[PDB]
Amino acid sequence: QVQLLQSGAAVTKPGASVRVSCEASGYNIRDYFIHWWRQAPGQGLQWVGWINPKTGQPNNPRQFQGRVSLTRHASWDFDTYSFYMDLKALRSDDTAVYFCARQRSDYWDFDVWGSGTQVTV
Amino acid sequence: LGFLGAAGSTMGAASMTLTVQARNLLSGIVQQLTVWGIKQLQARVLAVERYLRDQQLLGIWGCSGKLICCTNVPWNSSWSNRNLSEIWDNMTWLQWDKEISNYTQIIYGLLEESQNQQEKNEQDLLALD
Amino acid sequence: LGFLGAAGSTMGAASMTLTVQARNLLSGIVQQLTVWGIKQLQARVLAVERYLRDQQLLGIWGCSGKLICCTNVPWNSSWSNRNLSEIWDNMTWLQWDKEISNYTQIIYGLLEESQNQQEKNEQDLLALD
Amino acid sequence: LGFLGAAGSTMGAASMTLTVQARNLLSGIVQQLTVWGIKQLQARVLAVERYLRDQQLLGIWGCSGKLICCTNVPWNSSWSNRNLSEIWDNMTWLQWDKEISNYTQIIYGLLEESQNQQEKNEQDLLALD
Amino acid sequence: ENLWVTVYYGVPVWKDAETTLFCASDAHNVWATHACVPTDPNPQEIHLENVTEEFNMWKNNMVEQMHTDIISLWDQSLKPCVKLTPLCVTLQCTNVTNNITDDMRGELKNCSFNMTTELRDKKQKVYSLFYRLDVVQINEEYRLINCNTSAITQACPKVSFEPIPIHYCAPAGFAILKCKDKKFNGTGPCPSVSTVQCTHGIKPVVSTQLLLNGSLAEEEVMIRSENITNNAKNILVQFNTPVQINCTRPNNNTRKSIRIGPGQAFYATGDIIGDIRQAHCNVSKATWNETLGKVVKQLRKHFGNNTIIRFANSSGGDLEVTTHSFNCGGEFFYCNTSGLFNSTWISNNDSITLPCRIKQIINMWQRIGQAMYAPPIQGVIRCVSNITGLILTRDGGSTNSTTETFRPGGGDMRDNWRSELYKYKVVKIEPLGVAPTRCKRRVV
Amino acid sequence: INEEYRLINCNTSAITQACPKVSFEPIPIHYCAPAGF
Amino acid sequence: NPQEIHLENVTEEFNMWKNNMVEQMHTDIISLWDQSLKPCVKLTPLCV
Amino acid sequence: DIQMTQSPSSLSASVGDTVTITCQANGYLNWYQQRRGKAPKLLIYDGSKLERGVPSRFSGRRWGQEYNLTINNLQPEDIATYFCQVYEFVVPGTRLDL
Ligand SMILES: *[C@@H]1O[C@H](CO)[C@@H](O[C@@H]2O[C@H](CO)[C@@H](O[C@@H]3O[C@H](CO[C@H]4O[C@H](CO[C@H]5O[C@H](CO)[C@@H](O)[C@H](O)[C@@H]5O)[C@@H](O)[C@H](O[C@H]5O[C@H](CO)[C@@H](O)[C@H](O)[C@@H]5O)[C@@H]4O)[C@@H](O)[C@H](O[C@H]4O[C@H](CO)[C@@H](O)[C@H](O)[C@@H]4O[C@H]4O[C@H](CO)[C@@H](O)[C@H](O)[C@@H]4O)[C@@H]3O)[C@H](O)[C@H]2NC(C)=O)[C@H](O)[C@H]1NC(C)=O
Ligand SMILES: *[C@@H]1O[C@H](CO)[C@@H](O[C@@H]2O[C@H](CO)[C@@H](O[C@@H]3O[C@H](CO[C@H]4O[C@H](CO)[C@@H](O)[C@H](O[C@H]5O[C@H](CO)[C@@H](O)[C@H](O)[C@@H]5O)[C@@H]4O)[C@@H](O)[C@H](O[C@H]4O[C@H](CO)[C@@H](O)[C@H](O)[C@@H]4O[C@H]4O[C@H](CO)[C@@H](O)[C@H](O)[C@@H]4O)[C@@H]3O)[C@H](O)[C@H]2NC(C)=O)[C@H](O)[C@H]1NC(C)=O
Ligand SMILES: *[C@@H]1O[C@H](CO)[C@@H](O[C@@H]2O[C@H](CO)[C@@H](O[C@@H]3O[C@H](CO[C@H]4O[C@H](CO)[C@@H](O)[C@H](O[C@H]5O[C@H](CO)[C@@H](O)[C@H](O)[C@@H]5O)[C@@H]4O)[C@@H](O)[C@H](O[C@H]4O[C@H](CO)[C@@H](O)[C@H](O)[C@@H]4O)[C@@H]3O)[C@H](O)[C@H]2NC(C)=O)[C@H](O)[C@H]1NC(C)=O
Ligand SMILES: *[C@@H]1O[C@H](CO)[C@@H](O[C@@H]2O[C@H](CO)[C@@H](O[C@@H]3O[C@H](CO)[C@@H](O)[C@H](O)[C@@H]3O)[C@H](O)[C@H]2NC(C)=O)[C@H](O)[C@H]1NC(C)=O
Ligand SMILES: *[C@@H]1O[C@H](CO)[C@@H](O[C@@H]2O[C@H](CO)[C@@H](O[C@@H]3O[C@H](CO)[C@@H](O)[C@H](O)[C@@H]3O)[C@H](O)[C@H]2NC(C)=O)[C@H](O)[C@H]1NC(C)=O
Ligand SMILES: *[C@@H]1O[C@H](CO)[C@@H](O[C@@H]2O[C@H](CO)[C@@H](O[C@@H]3O[C@H](CO)[C@@H](O)[C@H](O)[C@@H]3O)[C@H](O)[C@H]2NC(C)=O)[C@H](O)[C@H]1NC(C)=O
Ligand SMILES: *[C@@H]1O[C@H](CO)[C@@H](O[C@@H]2O[C@H](CO)[C@@H](O)[C@H](O)[C@H]2NC(C)=O)[C@H](O)[C@H]1NC(C)=O
Ligand SMILES: *[C@@H]1O[C@H](CO)[C@@H](O[C@@H]2O[C@H](CO)[C@@H](O)[C@H](O)[C@H]2NC(C)=O)[C@H](O)[C@H]1NC(C)=O
Ligand SMILES: *[C@@H]1O[C@H](CO)[C@@H](O[C@@H]2O[C@H](CO)[C@@H](O)[C@H](O)[C@H]2NC(C)=O)[C@H](O)[C@H]1NC(C)=O
Ligand SMILES: *[C@@H]1O[C@H](CO)[C@@H](O[C@@H]2O[C@H](CO)[C@@H](O)[C@H](O)[C@H]2NC(C)=O)[C@H](O)[C@H]1NC(C)=O
Ligand SMILES: *[C@@H]1O[C@H](CO)[C@@H](O[C@@H]2O[C@H](CO)[C@@H](O)[C@H](O)[C@H]2NC(C)=O)[C@H](O)[C@H]1NC(C)=O
Ligand SMILES: *[C@@H]1O[C@H](CO)[C@@H](O[C@@H]2O[C@H](CO)[C@@H](O)[C@H](O)[C@H]2NC(C)=O)[C@H](O)[C@H]1NC(C)=O
Ligand SMILES: *[C@@H]1O[C@H](CO)[C@@H](O)[C@H](O)[C@H]1NC(C)=O
Ligand SMILES: *[C@@H]1O[C@H](CO)[C@@H](O)[C@H](O)[C@H]1NC(C)=O
Ligand SMILES: *[C@@H]1O[C@H](CO)[C@@H](O)[C@H](O)[C@H]1NC(C)=O
Ligand SMILES: *[C@@H]1O[C@H](CO)[C@@H](O)[C@H](O)[C@H]1NC(C)=O
Ligand SMILES: *[C@@H]1O[C@H](CO)[C@@H](O)[C@H](O)[C@H]1NC(C)=O
Ligand SMILES: *[C@@H]1O[C@H](CO)[C@@H](O)[C@H](O)[C@H]1NC(C)=O
Ligand SMILES: *[C@@H]1O[C@H](CO)[C@@H](O)[C@H](O)[C@H]1NC(C)=O
Q1: Which sites carry carbohydrate (chain F) (predicted)?
Q2: Fold designation for A1-121
């Protein structure tokens, strides 16, 4: 089952640093970019970033520079992989549904999505 | 000139280099770890096999030992519609190849039987004279 | 028909498929671990070698490039005693092969010299004319 | 006699065994661990490759299928200065080979084009008649 | 009267095709092992008058073959080598305090352990200097960083890892087309085509951020991003000039030897002679500025020419791409190149010394099934190289065609192979063909 | 082991042995030219 | 079938210590020797 | 510089209506479906291919930057928000209603 594990919802007071996560399941993670997306409730999706799981390499919008980080991890037997997203601080406009996705192809096809989680402030 | 120099000229002019072109079919492996050496070996085999397949066909066609031959097989004009001089005098053979490319297996079957098996039958009749 | 269809008919009828039969001498290895791949490699070599041995003989015999040829070598009638039509019109070539099978090396030596070396000597004399 | 028996006689006499000599070009590997077996494999490949290179040249030269041929190419007499009978009747072909050895690539280029490409051009003109 | 199609042979035909490349070289080094067949000093290029040919970068599988050919070599060189698994014994340590330059503090640890003598029944105390990068605390004492990962091995230090050019030759009946056009886009047709049966050597040398010792662009700095709108793609950058770089390992390295079993020497780091100093690299500052100006001009070809261009500190991720790394001098190095990117570009003393790091446990490529120890090399390391290009990436989500920014990135070795291999494609010669004639076959 | 004993090669590459069943007695070996030689 | 063929009227140079058959034999046997031992069990427990 | 537009707003169409939505964009275009409380799912990609397991009702076409998506015989289960996307950029959602 290719579907990603999705971490549970959480809420913190403003200025908090937070973490969310996902986990690889049915496929070889090395061959696909992982992406993060967020959306305000009542609003269209906003891209957050991507990470090259082989190298741990993040890519983020100028908007989020210095505020977010992406990490990746793997089982010592390498049969699972995990991803995390960190935010250094929170503001009320950081509330969003947050989720992981898999880049199926170079058209940025997203045939796998985490259920997402709700982050609130 | 040199190998593939004919790519710069029309099909009729390409005939001038055909013996040159044949030179490199088996060439460059003449003088000599699992890594590499097994690869070399595979390359040697490949070169040989391809060479033989062509020779086999020529022997079937009766065109063996020649770079130019004269088959007795007429071709269905629908495959191309250009005056013969308009073909031979204005294109790289490769360009022409692209045009002919969807009829090539028709032709090969024809060469095998429409003239060569048939010729051989007639040759046998002559052999009985 | 298809490959080996001639096994269902007499030797004269078998002539009709000879070009078909030649098609599979090098065929089926055209498109492509020590296990298997080394075996494949051995198979590739084997196919090539056998093919070449036959071609070598035909070149000696002067029958190269032909599936039918006309040697000038008479054969000693003791090897078989059947009317010629009684042979060609009633047996699978293989059946006939079994009958001829103990004379085959006699014949091959004859082909090499009794006609071909001798012919070449005469060819040289003609070359000197 | 047997293989290489001609080494004991003059070049003209050597012609008598040429079909014998050709017998061993592919022979002795007809019937059959990394050690040895890989070596065997290399030997099999080598024998094949050399055989093909010669056949390729003969096909270029139009001398294919023959142990004796009649090229139309004159040679520059400076390469040797002996009466023709004085050559053919008194030396091992190998001895003669040593004398010719520095002109051999001249000759090969000549055979390819001075007569064979040119002949083929003329053959084509005849093909158009 | 009606035309007959007839046989011709040796007519040139090209088919795109793939065959295994044949290795060859000029004239033990891992990269050639001296097993590649030596080759003729006769690069007889044949200009192909009146032709053009499509070449598609990132589509050629020569790149892939190279990528796995070198891997196979690497493993081959190490299969003879002795395992280091006796070294998973825990170590006592201290920070080295002997003649430490202030910015080197805590870089090295002196440690010791109870590991075995070559006798089955005996053990000995052993100690060596170690980089902090190669160890982790055993708990919040240390252990090698890879003892919870596939085992570390190393022997056979005698083999050289210095790059040697490697040539590849087409199999008989095949040929390598090449494009000489100085303006060539990574994909599509080229008018400059000429061919060779083989190619000039290409070094096996690798880098994680900047191309090293690559051929220079023929005319101008050039960029090959594939479809640039997709910013997940790595951006190739090729300099049309060299940028000299000098580097050192200033510490006077010394070596120790250990027996860990019969026949099993084990290298260890001796105490450094003299004051401890950080490894470093020098580049021209002025030249770096100038070449960046050349680069931004190239970047602007895809943007309005008043657009903002920016460079940046690395975004992190694994160290192997977070920093620049190289094996020059036979030993691995890493450096903080982010200072090189501390600039922005707008419309309209003489050198820099980068800080560096050394790690002796090498996890090659992306693989996690293997690791190896790098032996100490006595004395000061010196390195000189030409920087020939950049591997860059671009941040997603930009708007209004402005403030595009870039960072060092990639690190898949495949792109290094591409930096040279984009010049070529393999084709198959199909000498057989037919054409209509006025001739009909002669009577028997 | 010091001026007890140890095998003479323990300070040299390791000693191995198994498969005593194989014979080391000499057998003649022939070499044959490749075809065309 | 050791079918020797006497070569009438010929001579040939032979140089001992120049033939590389010797070298091939020398390394062929080595490869065999190692091949026979690669299956074999290590005795390293005996350094006690 | 990638840019995109869409015309769907929201739609009142009745069940069983074949319906269409359109967008235009620079570059390759993918379309997605989403429902409240749920992750988006791919429908069609690169302007022409349905994702595997997408219902037969879905279809679409491309003409350069033009893109069209339709649902034959719309079903009540198909009421959802919808998207057009190019790389990191996506149009705000639009939706079916009745
Ligand atoms: C990099 O990434 C990008 C981002 O995704 C990739 O996108 C691709 O970009 C390239 C070039 O920028 C495009 O190529 C060109 O695309 C257009 C659009 O093609 C479509 O429209 C066809 C109808 O077009 C006419 O009508 C429309 C308006 O309705 C006008 O916009 C047009 O201008 C035309 O007037 C339609 O028929 C096509 O679909 C059909 O064909 C495809 C097969 O190709 C089939 O699958 C379909 O089912 C269907 O049958 C299609 O929807 C074309 O107009 C272009 O044609 C011109 O250019 C060609 C070479 O560039 C040339 O061979 C053509 O004959 C034609 O040239 C004429 O016009 C030029 C000016 O427009 C003149 O300069 C020229 O001399 C001549 O007069 C061309 O095909 C890709 O389409 C686009 N991708 C997609 C999905 O659309 C890009 O591929 C990536 N690149 C690389 C290298 O990685
Ligand atoms: C971009 O490409 C450029 C060009 O390829 C690269 O630049 C070269 O890179 C290599 C690798 O970093 C450098 O090689 C190293 O150079 C050392 C110095 O060599 C010269 O000086 C010594 C004395 O110091 C002389 O003996 C040498 O003479 C030899 O070379 C000249 C030709 O230049 C010939 O004429 C001579 O006849 C000699 O053949 C040089 O003049 C050199 O010491 C070093 O070699 C040692 O290390 C290697 C393993 O890496 C051993 O194989 C070798 O045997 C040497 O080791 C001995 O010495 C050490 C102690 O010093 C002992 O511990 C050992 O046990 C052993 O006894 C090596 O060749 C090269 O100098 C450099 N070129 C320049 C211009 O700087 C860049 O690397 C490249 N960048 C990228 C990223 O790849
Ligand atoms: C790319 O460039 C960026 C920025 O130029 C680099 O990011 C910085 O890296 C350094 C080192 O990796 C970071 O410093 C480390 O921080 C930790 C903890 O710091 C916290 O506590 C401090 C007081 O102890 C406080 O001053 C810091 O506040 C800063 O950071 C917050 C963001 O988290 C920001 O809001 C603030 O305004 C300040 O900017 C902070 O709260 C500290 O433990 C480290 O010290 C140890 O290690 C050092 C050696 O590295 C050693 O000298 C010490 O004695 C001690 O052992 C160290 O200072 C810095 O915080 C990073 N900046 C940010 C914004 O996160 C980045 O490293 C570059 N890339 C790469 C690949 O290096
Ligand atoms: C480039 O391709 C073109 C065709 O694809 C070639 O064009 C040919 O050019 C030659 C010399 O420039 C022309 O030759 C001359 O023609 C006259 C006319 O009879 C003749 O009398 C002269 O003696 C001379 O040969 C030729 O007409 C022309 N066109 C053809 C052959 O169709 C050109 O040669 C190619 N260039 C190269 C370098 O291959
Ligand atoms: C099975 O084997 C036998 C011989 O081994 C084959 O027998 C042949 O059968 C055909 C048709 O049944 C006969 O052909 C006919 O002969 C007359 C006589 O002249 C001819 O005029 C007809 O036009 C027709 O060809 C043939 O006489 C007969 N015997 C032979 C050839 O010796 C039979 O064909 C084989 N079956 C198969 C399926 O191969
Ligand atoms: C050894 O080498 C020499 C030449 O290198 C060979 O000399 C030839 O020997 C034969 C018989 O001993 C001579 O043959 C006879 O010649 C007369 C003269 O016409 C002829 O009528 C006879 O019927 C007979 O054939 C021959 O003249 C002589 N010289 C040559 C051929 O130049 C000798 O044969 C070689 N020995 C061996 C065993 O190969
Ligand atoms: C090898 O084990 C080490 C721990 O011994 C693992 O290191 C972890 O690394 C991450 C990132 O720095 C930290 O969050 C953990 O706290 C570290 N663990 C400890 C024990 O320090 C590393 O992940 C392990 N590798 C394998 C494949 O499982
Ligand atoms: C190496 O091993 C020796 C014992 O084989 C260790 O010495 C022992 O240390 C522990 C606790 O540190 C004591 O309980 C024992 O009494 C010690 N043994 C003796 C004989 O006194 C030594 O500490 C080990 N070294 C390291 C660096 O771990
Ligand atoms: C790297 O360092 C070397 C020497 O430390 C520099 O080489 C100098 O090159 C110039 C130009 O030909 C010579 O005039 C000097 O004599 C050389 N120096 C020495 C000590 O020989 C080189 O320029 C440096 N490169 C960079 C980019 O800084
Ligand atoms: C890199 O270049 C710098 C200077 O360009 C060298 O640093 C100098 O070091 C010496 C002694 O260490 C000092 O006396 C100078 O004052 C330093 N220069 C500056 C500008 O601070 C450094 O040695 C060079 N390193 C290498 C490996 O070439
Ligand atoms: C690193 O330091 C060592 C010793 O501290 C240097 O070794 C010296 O080498 C010279 C010439 O080879 C000898 O005359 C000295 O006697 C050696 N020193 C000692 C203490 O034995 C070595 O040269 C230094 N490295 C470099 C690159 O100079
Ligand atoms: C860095 O690259 C340049 C250019 O490839 C090298 O300079 C070349 O040196 C060779 C041999 O000395 C000359 O034949 C070339 O003409 C030079 N290039 C130019 C453009 O003139 C330089 O040698 C390289 N650096 C090192 C350390 O080898
Ligand atoms: C030509 O060939 C086509 C199909 O290959 C066939 O339908 C047609 O009858 C043929 N006509 C002639 C005149 O050859
Ligand atoms: C060959 O056939 C293909 C598909 O049937 C067609 O697209 C192509 O244009 C044809 N080309 C030639 C030269 O016949
Ligand atoms: C036929 O051959 C045999 C032996 O093969 C021989 O004894 C006999 O004399 C020969 N007779 C004829 C007429 O060929
Ligand atoms: C061939 O010879 C063997 C034994 O000499 C004999 O048994 C067999 O019947 C013979 N067959 C033919 C067809 O000559
Ligand atoms: C013979 O050849 C030489 C060089 O091979 C040449 O110089 C000379 O002119 C030629 N003469 C004749 C008559 O062939
Ligand atoms: C061939 O040339 C070499 C050197 O040019 C010379 O020593 C030798 O005698 C020549 N031999 C013949 C037979 O031409
Ligand atoms: C060693 O250095 C680390 C930090 O570099 C420090 O936390 C530790 O206390 C030091 N230990 C000693 C014994 O100096």
Answers
A1: 2, 11
A2: Immunoglobulin-like (2.60.40)
